[PDB]
Amino acid sequence: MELIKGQALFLELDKKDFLSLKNNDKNIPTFAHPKNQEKILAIFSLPYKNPPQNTKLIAFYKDKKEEIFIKTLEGNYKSEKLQVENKKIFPPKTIQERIAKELKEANAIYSSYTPKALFNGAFNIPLNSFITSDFGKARTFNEKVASYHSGTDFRAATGTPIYAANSGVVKIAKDRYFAGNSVVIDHGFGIYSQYYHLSKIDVKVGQKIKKGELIGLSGASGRVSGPHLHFGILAGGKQVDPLDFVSKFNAIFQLEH
Ligand SMILES: [Zn+2]
Structure with missing residues (x-):
């Protein structure tokens, strides 16, 4: 995934057996997808100032572990x-x-x-x-x-x-x-x-x-x-x-x- 600095992303994950979503040691909160009852959502934002160059999120399930990689884009701000x-x-x-x-x-x-x-x-x-x-x-x-x-x-x-x-x-x-x-x-x-x-x-x-x-x-x-x-x-x-x-x-x- 790629995300321009200073923007947010809505990350979509499976709801069943989900345990936690983390960025390093920080827990990212989740909420229900309003349309699709099999999915949950989380908001991931990159700050405009001092964003990391890359991000690795980890989603833990009862029987799965998913690493999600997000590249920071500089955008074309004037x-x-x-x-x-x-x-x-x-x-x-x-x-x-x-x-x-x-x-x-x-x-x-x-x-x-x-x-x-x-x-x-x-x-x-x-x-x-x-x-x-x-x-x-x-x-x-x-x-x-x-x-x-x-x-x-x-x-x-x-x-x-x-x-x-x-x-x-x-x-x-x-x-x-x-x-x-x-x-x-x-x-x-x-x-x-x-x-x-x-x-x-x-x-x-x-x-x-x-x-x-x-x-x-x-x-x-x-x-x-x-x-x-x-x-x-x-x-x-x-x-x-x-x-x-x-x-x-x-x-x-x-x-x-
Ligand atoms: Zn203003």
Whole structure:
């Protein structure tokens, strides 16, 4: 198998007699295939930064042991230049305490695995506009700081209504230094959708949110070159190409009427 860095894969395995799926010493969680009752699924993601060159997964069965080899592909990501406020790439010392606390809070949330589906069928795109900055662009801020784009940006004037891409539970709903006003939704199975730089937040932590429900208004809060919506997906423990992930998820979990 081959996988571009920064993307997720849905691995399909036999359900009968399955015992565990591991990557080195790390157990990878599994969930039921919604269509095929003889199969289970697992999400495997490669990070954009510092992925391994190769991966060997091992699936253990009562009477089988299967090694699965995945080659990391570099992809064809391009570069872009952005101008932002200097304090958003070199934050004052008075602010680094908040940045560290916000980082620790987010790490805690993403390690809190929900072993059931909170979603309802396929994901929607949270905005009906167009991509202005695609996932994985290699970025330079102010000709000084290298970065990479960990989500996808959509055109949005300040005040554009933003709707939940799928049903789930709100885990973050507050102003953060870099992301600005942020909403993060747990959809189950380690899948989180992220909505950043908002001007207004319309949900609160712990809220059960349904697909298509208003979660806030787009803005220009946080580290920005101008107003837009940043949409992200964390899955398999990594930030992944969100629209690529949604296409792969929907191919499995979409429903009819
Ligand atoms: Zn972005």
